[PDB]
Design a binder for this molecule. Structure first.
Ligand code: P78
Ligand code: BOG
Length: 332
């Protein structure tokens, strides 16, 4: 190809097809609202910051682009376009990603509306539906939180990742277990759910040690079956040096809530990750009877992440990223 145009926005320089107009900053690496003229819809444009500065940077640009190109589901961000001003590989230095503009995050909705039980079902249902799709590609989100969830005026929701976070984090990620099953995202969904029922942060941790403290008051210190699975002797004693706590009865904590929502929370917010309900299982739970449709909860196409285990040169990553730009076929 098209013809590009240059525009300086808050000291940053944006070169984009003319297709997109009325570029407006949305804060922070830098995203702009824009008007797409080919369709007359509002978009969000992201300029990748310092994309190829290190090997690790370069691999991450490639990672994000491969990921976004693969995600094709109603409850997950999808790529509308990706472009570079560069006419060639030599010239390649910037990447821009295009997605549908949603002008509210779940945070902002929870500020000034107390959601009805029925809202909580539809919202959480959409998180699990997107999550079933992401998990079926063998991807873990790892940083699920209201500010990564986009919501429109029909309260339709999509999952994304802009790139305290700590409030929705699985206890295992914060003790650096390094394994991590997919249910770390289920833990996060539990924290989101409670805050939608309640209006308040389930675990408003002051810091990393305060975070863990609050989690254990609710869920309890590890029971005997859990300790049996803990391989490291230091970790075992570290767990034995924390004030020991009984599991609370959730019925007693979430006082006036749908008893089916309570029973769901009990299935998500379990210390032992092997015992958390999965996304697929939770879609089928009685709380979502009004929304559940087993024929409309699709899974992902095989996702090849063999790249995650390669150590390559900046310009290799760079060139792989370039192939991916060129081969983009936009959605209908
Ligand atoms: C798990 C899942 C939800 C599917 C995502 C992973 C990543 C990701 O790239 N990774 C790899 C990089 S990182 O390691 O920093 C995090 C995980 C997303 N990336 C993403 O959501 N990117 C965005 C965000 C806002 C946009 C605004 C306008 C236009 C374009 C936009 C694209 S979404
Ligand atoms: C005191 C707080 C400690 C947190 C207990 C974390 C238990 C999480 O669960 C553990 O997850 C691992 C994968 O991450 C699995 O290999 C283990 O089998 C599983 O029990």
């Amino acid at each position: 190809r098209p013809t590009f145009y240059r525009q300086e926005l808050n000291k940053t320089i944006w070169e984009v097809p003319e297709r997109y107009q009325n570029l407006s900053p949305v804060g922070s690496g830098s995203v702009c609202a824009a008007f797409d003229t080919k369709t007359g819809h509002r978009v969000a444009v992201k300029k990748l910051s310092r994309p190829f500065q290190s090997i690790i940077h370069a691999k991450r640009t490639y990672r994000e682009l491969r990921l976004l190109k693969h995600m094709k589901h109603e409850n997950v961000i999808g790529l509308l376009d990706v472009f570079t001003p560069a006419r060639s590989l030599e010239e390649f230095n910037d990447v821009y990603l295009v997605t549908h503009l949603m002008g509210a995050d779940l945070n902002n909705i929870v500020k000034c509306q107390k959601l009805t039980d029925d809202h909580v079902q539809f919202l959480i249902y959409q998180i699990l539906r997107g999550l079933k799709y992401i998990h079926s590609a063998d991807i873990i989100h790892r940083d699920l939180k209201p500010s990564n969830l986009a919501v429109n005026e029909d309260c339709e929701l999509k999952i994304l990742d802009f790139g305290a976070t700590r409030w929705y984090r699985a206890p295992e990620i914060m003790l650096n277990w390094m394994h991590y099953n997919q249910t770390v995202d289920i833990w996060s969904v539990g924290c989101i759910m409670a805050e939608l029922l309640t209006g308040r942060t389930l675990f408003p941790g002051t810091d990393h040690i305060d975070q863990l403290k609050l989690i254990l008051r609710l869920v309890g210190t590890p029971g005997a079956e859990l300790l049996k699975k803990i391989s490291s002797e230091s970790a075992r004693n570290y767990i034995q040096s924390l004030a020991q706590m009984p599991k609370m009865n959730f019925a007693n904590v979430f006082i006036g809530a749908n008893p089916l929502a309570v029973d769901l929370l009990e299935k998500m917010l379990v210390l032992d990750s092997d015992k958390r309900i999965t996304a697929a299982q939770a879609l089928a739970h009685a709380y979502f009877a009004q929304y559940h449709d087993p024929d409309d909860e699709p899974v992902a196409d095989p996702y090849d992440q063999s790249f995650e285990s390669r150590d390559l040169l900046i310009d290799e990553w760079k060139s792989l990223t370039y192939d991916e730009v060129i081969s983009f076929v936009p959605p209908p």
